[PDB]
Symmetry: D3
Subunit: 276 residues, 6 copies
């Protein structure tokens, strides 16, 4: 297999850095009203054009997320503002590669947060691979009519109405060989209820681990590890980071973080090329 | 048994409110430089004058904690400054009750943070009851010569030099009946590596749960639960709070939080009287 | 507390006895085309009129289950036909007791099968108590647009649209004291993904265990245990039956089965009276 | 290693199809007396003539199983009748290959049901590899003098009298490398108390998974999975099937089912040749 | 209920003290050939004459254990010699109380060692309660034709021939209420594969814990704990001792050790009376 | 990589054989005062001179262990006397190889017993790899001021004073790839609280497993396994031995025992050469 891997730029988000790095700048006796920072970071997705079929990792934000008629609650829009030109919409990024949503065989959902599962509803011809615990959690949000938070009611509503085809990764399930040199990593609970990663073995580029929000940035990764300001399973989060570090060492793989602005700038984007 | 329970005021501490309540005031697009605050809370201990023997819950901060010649690292002093008059020192609070350290049969260490284990070194004639995971973690800090953090090297140094007598509560150990109507609750991992609580049944007052840092404040308790800005085991923390809520319901017990300023002000202090 | 407990007759169902008792009559060399039986059994619910608030255990079938315009798939209607006069509808049974749906404080859903969770949508003023694993499973059925089976898409649709208030019993959660002498038993996985039971302690009647489909009938119960023809967690099912037997012995409680025609006939129904 | 693999025909069995496929033909309102059928399936064993030593997988039924003087209880004979010519007896099948029981180094007992462990007593010069949970269960049947069921008292009696040499596979034991390209798969609880499979890697044929009763037939395998009418551990059974499906995918292995009539007919029998 | 509890003297055993207390007298540079000692200890059983039925705890050694025609292997006889007069045989001890074997409702087998399970074969009218792991272990000894060790082949042979009625305590099974004030304690693995204890609440005497070999002697009990020279599950053993210590404290119960010569001297034997 | 592996002779120890092999010579009716023996065995360490960095496995005893001014308690010196010439001190063994302590990158502590962790304090430039459970246990010994036993207070004191850099292997952590063909095996609890082994793949010599005290001698190894006279976790110990047996078979590796005098005689020592 001689696949091509694309990094697609799906815009920028901003939020309190305390979300990204817990207690990054604590108040002190001489600085008791310490102020935080409003940091900008990239939202991106990865397409693997594989001979066995096209694989998509994450789906960024829904084009109708922001605005007064948006899907995101006002509170969400104010705390996690997403900025994207039409060019940045996943549909458009794929189109520019002559890829239609119906051409996607597998979508790997790292998790079901607003900035990763926004465009799942588009892929009605794919098998959507998601952690069963993440799926369960999101559905509870939906059933409980939770309108605020990182799980977008309107997005979930759309997944159901569009009759997506789901394959859940069970809590105690081994990693999944999706195709030659493409492995779905079952990270389990940490950042969210259930995290999935990807290990890609490219002929000329070698090993790549897509960590998503298992590791926000190089600052998160360290060492030492700097966990995010809010977290589902702290123990699971720390275990997952260490696990990724081990896999990276043993397989001589690069680790691609969820939202590292510096790393993202160095990526070859879909407007410039790909990784073979 | 007709026991007397005393609440002893061991001064005040201040810190970033984000420590207490995670992401209490997140930055927004309109408030991108959102400032935190430096909140003040009480440090206190509880003495149970029981016919079977005096039981002490927590030990506050060491009198030699703060200052240029202090045991606390300068960074620790600036992030978590402790203010206390001489009358606030545990040794002094006990003396006013005509109680000598040598008189204490049991000391229950909720955990070994600087604001709870400060004066353990005093009680050389007692059995020190602590969670085995907490003890292990603290000892690792010592062995690794960790100077910064919530575990004070000089304090641990003194515990060893004073040849304290330890009984560790095992990770999977049942609750311990210390005395008639006094039970050590094995909360396990959460806020710290290993948390212990206390349930006291007084003839007149009824049930009291000493939660310590298992629950910082009423705001923490909710519902809904508002967890602290940092946390060892998030899942364990949440489980522990809900467990306490259940025990309180089933036993019709009051819940005494670790550091609730408003609750503390309503307590009858050792200088005014006791509970029976 | 001097509560009154009512048994409400919510009609009759029929199905292959092999569903109820696995391999009840296996084919043999001399009877190779052994035929099954189509057995009839009661659907019922229990109301506990408690001074602390009214508690409802199970909700039977939705009045619009059967028929060409019914909610149940044709296949379901043919395999599990429900027969009920208007008098048998839960709404009507409650009305005859001068109880309105909005008067119900707690609904305990043993599980979310079609014959137990049919009328959940009515109780918009209650807290609905359900096993988290059962809730998760049902929601997946909904999200996956599963139209056939024991989980009714239309029913689930209604729960969400009616904005029911859910309290999920966690997989490893202790039993819940709902009110004086009313305990929700966390049976876990067996018959379905997550089973809840009830133990009621009545002043004059004594102990009652509501087992629901944890135990179909006296034939199921034995001894020896005769498990149902289809089952989620066989090991969990067997463990649960034995657990109920132990609780029954230790608390001298009656066991009320899910669908025992003989036992049901002996019950004092809501048209005759109640249990104090 | 250039091993030869032989498939040995050990006759036919019949039973209620409901045993094979649970609720295969449920009663309906239009067919309330739905009849089952008495399906016929093969009993077979596999001999691996390996340079490191001959390995036998399963041992079929004891030649003294059926008849008025038979080891099988009359009830067992009528529910699971076994038909076999003399040429079908394992001892005879081996003799035709010029293989004596004393020549067998290893016998892998998938489990200890009457149709798999029938002739263990023959192999007194071999190490008998069996799951420890299966061995324990079988021995309990013996000790409890259980005359009915799938565990034949007289067979077990003979194992003990013939002083067979056992190696039990522990519940949490890794797969066992028996010989070059021969691995015992520890499937654990499911169909029975403890299931063992085999993965064979042949130079010419490639990968073969002997699943035995972990998967009865292609119908069982699906997807979707159609489980048997009775089952020890339903969760374990489902997990095992999916595990086998994964192993088959990852190793590009064929899956040989326990009792698939159509698959068996396509096999090259020991009377025609072997696999290499 | 007003039961009578009898202690029955079933003779004396001797063995290397190192069996009783591990490394009781280690070799030193000044004593490199350190000598052990051959200590004597009692074998005893407990009959609870309960209004609900007679309960027997342990059964001592089989009368045909010792001698050239004895069931015990020569090595066993030389390492663990049992000395008992005819009066000491359990059958005779019972007969002198006007109790026939057929009169026993329940036999609780602490474990199946030669000195506890010797006379099980007598009680063909009782339910024999044993830990499932202990039962499995013993049966494997039998099936493997182990004619040496602490599990007597001939004894096990007799259990099966005499068609004893077994009720196994499952590994993760709760304590069993056998009768008013009589509870079987599920100790689990430790001394052996599966240990059972008994807690008896007598109206006049109060609480008694029958520890059997969970605790050999007061020396074993300490504290500190001094474990035996050979042990199946060291961690389980230690946990069990501490569990017994807790139960004893919480229930104000006496602990009756397995083989404490000094304690056994102080008991009232069946020749002088009983405990009420 | 072309590493050189050195076996360094760090003297001889003697102790009661009962420590090495539990109940090796039990008392009998004809030998009631059976004598033990005082057996001698080697203390040794392994240096892997790897291109990626020098790796040291174990560190033998501290040079100031024995004598009236020694670190070892008198009781310890008499029970476990260590005899070593100056040439046998690790520091000198290393010096003769032109290796300074500061030259060591990694020290793998199999465990922290007196005969393995004696010279840890020398390697202030290395990362010290130890099992977290072993580390915790030793530190508790120190904090509890245990001045007897297999954990040397003065040794631990020195580790902390010398500011060693620790990397703890977590209880549920995978094996660690330390360098090309060098893997730390996480054996877990058994002989001690937490055992670490090493697997080395040498280009010329092939596979070597350093078992340390996971397996004392070939007699320990069997089969059958003959466990030591004292043991932390008997089940863990047995599991570990069998695990090592499996690894050895699957990787065609030699197993180097902790203290096998006969095996150690056959090794090439650092005075004669090395293994490539
Ligand atoms: C009840 C609503 C509370 C509002 C805050 C809760 C949001 C959950 C915290 C979180 O994970 C924020 C988030 O989803 N951030 C994105 C941005 C980077 O990757 C993320 O996870
Ligand atoms: C780089 C280490 C030093 C930075 C401090 C991080 C340790 C924070 C641990 C924590 O939970 C803070 C703390 O101990 N707070 C006190 C105040 C209230 O009760 C507490 O635990
Ligand atoms: C894909 C649809 C398959 C149709 C059969 C599946 C139904 C699940 C089996 C079952 O539990 C039937 C059921 O729900 N029966 C009711 C009647 C008595 O209590 C019950 O659980
Ligand atoms: C009352 C006990 C006797 C009734 C028989 C019940 C045992 C059924 C166990 C089973 O799974 C049937 C069985 O062994 N079938 C064979 C045929 C195919 O492979 C098998 O396991
Ligand atoms: C090293 C050869 C010994 C032969 C194997 C016999 C196993 C002995 C282990 C044991 O526990 C002996 C035993 O059962 N002793 C009785 C006597 C006191 O209570 C006992 O457990
Ligand atoms: C019964 C009094 C003994 C004093 C306590 C010392 C503990 C001895 C336990 C042990 O394992 C001794 C030890 O560490 N021996 C060394 C020598 C061989 O490898 C070892 O483990
Ligand atoms: Co996220
Ligand atoms: Co704290
Ligand atoms: Co149901
Ligand atoms: Co079978
Ligand atoms: Co014993
Ligand atoms: Co050691
Ligand atoms: Fe994100
Ligand atoms: Fe605190
Ligand atoms: Fe039902
Ligand atoms: Fe079969
Ligand atoms: Fe004994
Ligand atoms: Fe050693």
């Amino acid at each position: 297999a001689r696949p091509k891997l694309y990094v697609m730029d799906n815009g920028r988000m901003r939020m309190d850095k305390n979300w990204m790095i817990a207690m990054h700048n604590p108040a002190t006796i001489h600085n008791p009203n310490a102020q935080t920072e409003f940091v900008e970071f990239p939202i991106y997705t990865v397409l693997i054009d594989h001979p066995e079929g096209k694989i998509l990792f994450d789906t960024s934000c829904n084009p109708n997320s922001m605005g007064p008629q948006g899907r995101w609650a006002e509170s969400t829009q104010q705390m996690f503002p997403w900025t994207a030109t039409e060019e940045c919409y996943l549909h458009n990024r794929l189109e520019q590669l002559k890829v239609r949503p119906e051409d996607i065989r597998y979508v790997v959902a790292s998790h079901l947060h607003l900035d990763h599962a926004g465009c799942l509803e588009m892929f009605t011809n794919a098998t959507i691979i998601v952690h069963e615990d993440e799926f369960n959690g999101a559905l509870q949000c939906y059933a409980r009519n939770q309108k605020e938070g990182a799980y977008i009611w309107a997005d979930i509503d759309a997944w159901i109405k569009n009759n997506l085809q789901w394959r859940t990764v069970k809590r105690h399930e081994d990693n999944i060989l999706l195709a030659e040199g493409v492995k779905v990593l079952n990270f389990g609970s940490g950042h969210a209820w259930g995290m999935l990663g990807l290990h890609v073995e490219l002929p000329e580029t070698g090993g790549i681990i897509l960590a998503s929000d298992a590791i926000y940035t190089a600052e998160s990764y360290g060492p030492p590890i700097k966990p995010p300001g809010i977290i589902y399973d702290s123990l699971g989060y720390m275990n997952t980071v260490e696990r990724i570090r081990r896999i990276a060492q043993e397989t001589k793989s690069q680790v691609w973080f969820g939202h590292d602005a510096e790393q993202f700038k160095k990526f070859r984007k879909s407007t410039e090329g790909y990784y073979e």
